Amino acid sequence: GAMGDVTKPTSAKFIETGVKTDGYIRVNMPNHPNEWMISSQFKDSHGNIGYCMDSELPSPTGSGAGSLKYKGAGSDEFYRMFKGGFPSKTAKELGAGNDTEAWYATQLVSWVLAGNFKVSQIVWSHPNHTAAETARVKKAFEKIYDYAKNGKDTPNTEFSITASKTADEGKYHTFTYKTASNKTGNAKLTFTSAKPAGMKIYDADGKEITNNTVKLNSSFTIKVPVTTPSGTLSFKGTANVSTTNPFTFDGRGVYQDAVVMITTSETKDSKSLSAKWTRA
């Protein structure tokens, strides 16, 4: 199995949406019983929601903050928090009564995943919100958290090239292969042995490829002249795909660190394939 190389972002800029809350819960912190966990909703400059990693630092927004430099790649738990939390899932789907509750429930998951406090420290009540409000938040939290901790989905890029059929056609030995991926993009073929003279590559529509590039979720055909001495050819593909993964950014000990889904590129190899032919 191959390992994909995800291109890392270098920085991110965050903007307040205007949504804020004093929180629907409190936390027994080590020196501070029933400490409030207030928050401001923010987005990165491409309009994707950011979540706070540090409960005791201010939001990473305004002229002071500026851009936050890249810190690291978010775990599968953080990936799932985004996929199974707000706004990827609606308030109704999460059991939250409105979008503020759904968002805060997700931020609560973020704080716990980042290690700010344990679930046993959460006080499920707040003086400015009713028990029913807090309980919807609790229900949403538990759904999202359970999925983040125990769900199976990851940002993994699947990529394969698989031989489907072979045939002699006209003046060529032909070898057809199927490409497959769960991400959009294309693949580049690299030949790992000598290429026979007069070798050609064709796309699924029968049109010649001359830039060694193939489509994903498609097919292509390699053609080797029947005049070629008996032997073998080996190759692989390297997919170049678009992928949306969670990344963390550095608040520099002044603003909170923040995690956000960013669309970037990834390269990933297929397995090694061989075409074999015998000269008539």
Residue numbers in the entry: 1 to 34, 35A, 36 to 184, 185A, 186 to 280
Task: Cite, word for word, the article reporting this structure.
An increasing number of surface‐associated proteins identified in Gram‐positive bacteria are characterized by intramolecular cross‐links in structurally conserved thioester, isopeptide, and ester domains (TIE proteins). TEDs are predicted at the distal end of a large number of surface proteins from Gram‐positive bacteria, and the name TIE (thioester, isopeptide, ester) proteins have been introduced for this family. Internal thioester bonds, formed between Cys and Gln side‐chains and first identified in the second thioester domain (TED) of the Streptococcus pyogenes minor pilin Cpa,3 play a negligible role in protein stability, but are suggested to mediate covalent bacterial adhesion. Structures of Bacillus anthracis, vancomycin‐resistant Staphylococcus aureus, and vancomycin‐resistant Enterococcus faecium TEDs show a head domain with Class I topology extended by a β‐sandwich; the latter contributes the thioester bond‐forming Gln via a β‐hairpin insertion into the head domain.
The B. anthracis BaTIE and the 86 kDa E. faecium EfmTIE86 proteins are predicted to comprise a Class II TED as well as three and five CnaB‐type isopeptide domains (IPDs), respectively. EfmTIE86 was identified in genomes of vancomycin‐resistant Enterococcus faecium clinical isolates. SaTIE‐TED (Gln254‐Gly502) and EfmTIE86‐TED (Asp39‐Ala314) were determined by ESI‐MS to be 17 Da lighter than predicted (suggesting the presence of a thioester bond), and readily yielded high‐quality crystals. SaTIE‐TED and EfmTIE86‐TED crystal structures were determined using Se‐SAD phasing and standard refinement procedures. Continuous electron density between Cys and Gln side‐chains either previously shown or predicted to form thioesters (SaTIE‐TED: Cys296 + Gln467,5 EfmTIE86‐TED: Cys88 + Gln292) confirmed the presence of these bonds. Despite pairwise identities of 18–23%, all three Class II TEDs in this study display very similar tertiary structures. With exception of EfmTIE86‐TED Trp146, side‐chains of these residues hydrogen‐bond with the thioester‐forming Cys backbone.
